[PDB]
Each structure stands twice: as C-alpha cells, then as structure tokens.
Design a protein around this ligand. Structure first.
Ligand code: K
Ligand code: K
Ligand code: K
Ligand code: MG
Ligand code: MG
Length: 136
RNA sequence: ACAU
DNA sequence: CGATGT
C-alpha cells in the first residue's frame, strides 16, 4: 500500500480466451476513460494486457506525463520488462492481426525509452482495478 | 502456488 | 467448468 492515485490504470476485456480482445486505460482517480482499443477478433488475455500497458506507455510519453501505470497482470508486467511477449497463441491466419500488434508493440519498446513505473495493482487489498470491464 |  | 501465463 497505498494507491498512487496520480496514475493510469489499464485492463483487458475479452469474449472467450482465446477470443475477442479489447483494452482500455483510465484515470485511476476519476475513472475517466482515456483510450480504448477497437476489438480484435482473436487474441489471448495476456496479449491484450501486454498491448494495454504498451499503449499506456506510448500515450503517456506523447503527453510528456511521468505518471505510473497500474496493471493487475503479473504476466504482462514481466513481458513489458523483458520487451518480449512470450505468448503460446498459435501464429496462423486467424491470429495474424493480434500477432502483428504484439510484434509492433515489442518493436516500439525496442526503439524508444521511458521512465514510467509499471506497478502491480493489488486486487486482493484494493478491489478490482479501475479499468476493469465488469465481465466476471 | 501465484497473477489473470 | 474452460483458458492464459510465471
Ligand atoms: K472483468
Ligand atoms: K482481476
Ligand atoms: K493454471
Ligand atoms: Mg486484468
Ligand atoms: Mg479485469
């Protein structure tokens, strides 16, 4: 503890896993939605969580903001730190789009810098992350 | 087991 | 109940 209220919170939403994947980013203090990704027909929860963090890094850098990012995904936080999304999702024609976005997000991480702290949202102490979709 |  | 991940 405790919550850094001056932050951006991100989360994935899906219809199936693998299935249709979307994500959004919100102001932790207010819940204002700051970005939302158009649904991607097939992806995994963890690919979506990864894309959401990277989009948040890009969003904050473009705006010269030093705010931290909260994610509830141990996996996606590690993948961003490693600059490598270690997804098991088959690469085929159906999954081409999500894998293109994941590849492009890795490419961005490998060509840009950032100081943004990427913090674990402590769901067991604080309840659901503010960017949650309410689908569970 | 933990995080989704 | 099923799936994605460390
Ligand atoms: K949900
Ligand atoms: K959760
Ligand atoms: K498991
Ligand atoms: Mg989540
Ligand atoms: Mg959620």
């Amino acid at each position: 503890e405790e919550i850094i209220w001056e932050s951006l919170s991100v989360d994935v939403g899906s219809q199936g896993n693998p299935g249709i994947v979307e994500y959004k980013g919100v102001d932790t203090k207010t819940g204002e939605v700051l970005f939302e990704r158009e649904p991607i027909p097939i992806g995994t929860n963890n690919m979506g969580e990864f894309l959401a963090i990277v989009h948040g890094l890009r969003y904050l850098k473009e705006r010269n903001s030093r705010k931290p990012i909260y994610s509830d995904s141990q996996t996606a936080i590690k993948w961003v730190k490693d600059k490598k999304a270690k997804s098991t999702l088959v690469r085929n024609e159906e999954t081409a789009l999500i894998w293109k976005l994941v590849d492009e997000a890795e490419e961005w991480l490998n060509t840009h810098t950032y100081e943004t702290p990427i913090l674990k949202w402590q769901t067991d102490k604080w309840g659901e992350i503010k960017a949650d979709y309410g689908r569970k």
